[PDB]
Structure 1
Amino acid sequence: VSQETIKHVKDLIAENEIFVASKTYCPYCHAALNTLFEKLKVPRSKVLVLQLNDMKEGADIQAALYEINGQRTVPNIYINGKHIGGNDDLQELRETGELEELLEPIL
């Protein structure tokens, strides 16, 4: 995986208040996106959702995200440039009452 690809993924993570790498058929991605837009009412203009399976760079992006954060699955969620993880990770922050503070500066 190229150095330039890593930098491109870093850039997209920093230029967007929430970053989700997803796949259109992944039910975990549907759960996470549903939580974000529908339950937590996060404006869509604040979220970059990349459906990697619908994109040329799909595979390079996922591999780049492994190099960056060690995660290999989707959804791969960043909030305010901070690495969240998958849907389990997102749902867990809700259950510990800790997600609310990460969303403040954003929402």
Structure 2
Amino acid sequence: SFGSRMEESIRKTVTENTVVIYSKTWCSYCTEVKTLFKRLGVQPLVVELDQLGPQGPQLQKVLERLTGQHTVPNVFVCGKHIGGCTDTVKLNRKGDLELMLAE
């Protein structure tokens, strides 16, 4: 099915890239996690859901099916789900993100 395939694209994108951020261009919280990986000399793979037409809300429902989170940003580092803005922020004050980025 389409929903299976979409679920499989995400598992793939997340295993293949260091940082993946599911995102919306108009969202400050999203801008903030993006900005945070930049200040670390990391370039995240960024999927802007609002730029995918009807596929954006599908992806969001599929992310929620996968990870239980429906909100953006939805953040994966090194194949693992982090997964929100205050979770990524808190995991980068406690400094454990510098570490898990390696490699």
TM-score for both structures, normalised by structure 1: 0.88
Contact kept, 8 Å, 2:21 with 2:75, in 1: the verdict is yes
In the TM superposition, what is the alpha-carbon distance from 1:18 to its structure 2 partner?
Answer: 0.8
* Local SS of the residue matching 1:40: coil
For 2:19 and 2:75, locate their aligned partners in 1 and report how far apart those are by CA, in whole Å: 7
2:24 corresponds to which letter in structure 1? K
Task: Quote the RMSD (CA, aligned, Å).
Answer: 1.3
Partner of 1:101: 99
Deviation per residue, 1:18-73 (Å, 9 max, x gap)? 11000000110000000111x2121x2xx210000001321111111101110111
Q: Identity over the aligned pairs, expressed in percent? A: 34
CA–CA distance in 2 between the matches of 1:94 and 1:14?
21
Divergent runs of 4+, >3 A? none
Count matched residues: 101
How far is 1:97 from its partner?
A: 2.3
Residue type at the aligned position of 2:92 = R
Residue of structure 2 in register with 1:28 after alignment? 29
| Partner secondary structure for residue 35 of structure 2 | helix
Residue 4 (structure 2) aligns with: 3
Q: For the residues of structure 2 that align with 1:93 and 1:85, how far apart are their CA atoms?
A: 10
